[PDB]
Structure formats: C-alpha cells, structure tokens
Amino acid sequence: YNYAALAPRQSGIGTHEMHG
Amino acid sequence: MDEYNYAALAPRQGSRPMLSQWSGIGTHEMHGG
Amino acid sequence: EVMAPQPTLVAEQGAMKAVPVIKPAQPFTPAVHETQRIVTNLPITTAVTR
Amino acid sequence: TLGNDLRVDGATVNITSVNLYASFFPMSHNTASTLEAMLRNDTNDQSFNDY
Amino acid sequence: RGNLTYRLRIPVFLPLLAPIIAAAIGAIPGIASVAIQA
Amino acid sequence: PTHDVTTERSQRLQLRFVPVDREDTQYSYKTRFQLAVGDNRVLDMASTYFD
Amino acid sequence: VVLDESNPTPSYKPVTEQKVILPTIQVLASKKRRMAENEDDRGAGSVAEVQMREVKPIQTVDVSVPDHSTPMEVVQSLSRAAQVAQRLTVEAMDLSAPVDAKPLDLKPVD
Question: Which positions, given as ranges, span the membrane (chain E) (predicted)?
C-alpha cells in the first residue's frame, strides 16, 4: 500500500437520497 | 541462503532444494564415429 | 573513486602454456565476497574478493 | 527399396502449406527478463559444435 | 511475505507464547490464516 | 593431456615372439617363448594371447 | 536494558530501535529483493507467519504481517500479547482436551 491508489493526475463520501 | 542464489526456483525435497552440481553446466558430444 | 583494475588471467593446460582464461565463476558468499560499486557516483554493484 | 528413378516413374509431390510451430516454456517474466539480460551479456555467449 | 517484519525478544509441558501470538495476530481484522512455524 | 603420458622414442605397440623352441607329441604341443618387457616400458598380461 | 542485538536474518534490516515494553519489540523492514513479475505481488495476500527462533541465553519470535495491516495496530497487539505471555509464563487450558468430562465423575465423588 502507498497512500491508496493514485488519482488521475493533472460530500465526497456518503449518500442521503430519500423521499417518495 | 535462498537470497544469494536461485534456490526457490529449484524443486524442493523437503527443506533442501535439489540443485545441480556446480560442474554440471556445459556439454561436449563430438566424434566422427 | 574509480574501481581498481582487475588482473587478467592466463592459465596453462597441456602443452598450451598461455591460454587466455577468464576469472573462474564462484557462487556469491558474504564471508568471501562483498558487493562494491564499480563507480561511486552511480550504483553498479558487483562481487569482489574483499 | 529399389534403386529406381522416381522422376521417370512419375512420382510427384505437391506442397500445400508450410508453417512452423514454436513452443515457449511459460516462465514468469520476472525470471525470464533476468535470464535474457544475463544471456545478452558477452561472457554468457552460447557455444555450439557440430557432432 | 511483506516488507515489514516485527521481532519480539521475550526474556522467557505445553507451549503458549506461539498460540498467544497467533491469537493476537488473528485478532487483526485484515489478517486471516495465521501460520505458526518453528 | 600431453605431458608424461606418451613417449616418442620409437617403440612398437605390438610384438610377436617367435618361440625359442618347440616340441610336439601325440598328446600335447609345447612351445617356449622368451619375452622381454623392454627396458622402460611395462607390459600388462591381459594382452599376450597365443596365436 | 537491551541485551541482544543480533539480527539473525541478513535480508531484513532494522528500521527502529529495540523499544521496550513496560520484553522488547524491534521493527525490521526488508531490503531490496529480486525482480517481481508484476507490482501487485508483494502486498498481495493476508496470511501472517509467526516464525520461532532458538532460545538465546531469551526467546525471539519473527512475526510477519501483510503490508495493509496498520503498523500501530500490529505493534499494540504484539505488545499486549507479549505482556500476556510474560504474565502467564494452567487448568483452564487443560480443560480444553485432556481432562475429559465423564471420566471427571469418579474422582469428584470417589
């Protein structure tokens, strides 16, 4: 491991989708 | 010792890998008869 | 520091008394052989007889 | 089995297709690259002799 | 194997240190199938 | 090898010894040979077959 | 304080000093190795090896964990295990095979 996988070089986490 | 030579490549016989004798490489077959 | 020159070998076999001969091959052993850079600037390690 | 001329006898050969089948030993590129590098050196040249 | 190796130098019937270390390693969520060799 | 393995001083590989004396009888044929093993050569008696 | 500094394996080099447990714990990284066929070969895996070393007049254990494991968690778990082993070095372990249950009915009453 090395600081996770690299990102493509040049709320992030979670969803709150509800209602119906 | 498996880091100073190719011993993981050779098939094992328990804990001792079965390497060839040092003077085993090379061949010579030659005659005219 | 440049690597010190290695002596060339010439052996004898039969009547042949001046056959050119390369240094014999020996399996690497830490007690006898050590890895020394040929040129200190860039790492090209090789075995020497200490 | 008879020392007879086949040209006059009329035997003919007609070659349809010619291919060669190379066989590769599957060896991990880890050690295969090392082996080819060590055999690409000048001291590890392969010597062959006619029998 | 792994790049990092940890070494413990304990001052020191049935052996117990090896089972204890194996259980401790198995307690790690990301590690399974602890192997004991002597 | 070529050192102290073979001479060049003109000695024969095979020697034929004519019998010194011969005597025949209705029962047996007896021959006597006087073989000399050189001066600086060694003979092996695995050779020396009667002809 | 700090009795043995031997490094039985030459291929692994120390990276931290022999920190003491209030045994001692030493973390050793691995030197360079041969080529790998592909980069996804070193950290790939989950099995951990706990190698035993001959007693040096003290015992040494070589525990190797896969890369993805957190070094802090591994160190803390090893320290707790070492403390437990030092404290305990019983009948509870004996109960879990060579004591039996039905045979443990003559002795208790007769």
Answer: 13-36
Q: Which residues of B touch D50 (CB under 8 A)?
A: 30
For E28, which of G3, G26, G69 is closest by C-beta distance? G69
Structure method: cryo-EM
Instruction: Return d(Cα D23, Cα G39) in angstroms, integer.
Output: 27
3-state secondary structure of E30: coil
| Inter-chain CB proximity E18 and G65 less than 8 Å | no
Residue E29 burial (CB count, 10 A):
8
For this entry, resolution in Å reads 3.3
Alpha helices in D1-51 (DSSP H): 6-9, 29-39
| Closest residue to G64, CB basis, from E5, E14, E20 | E5
Q: Whose structure tokens read 């328990």?
A: B14
Residues of C with CB under 8 A from a CB of B: 27-30
Chain A residues with CB under 8 Å of G43 CB are 1
C-alpha to C-alpha distance for C35 and C32, rounded to whole angstroms: 11
Residues of B in contact with G10 (CB under 8 A): 3
Q: Residue C2 has what DSSP assignment?
A: B
Give F41→chain C minimum CA distance, Å: 23
CA neighbor of G8 nearest in space, from G50, G79, G56, G77: G56
The secondary structure element, H or E, covering residue E21 is helix E17-26
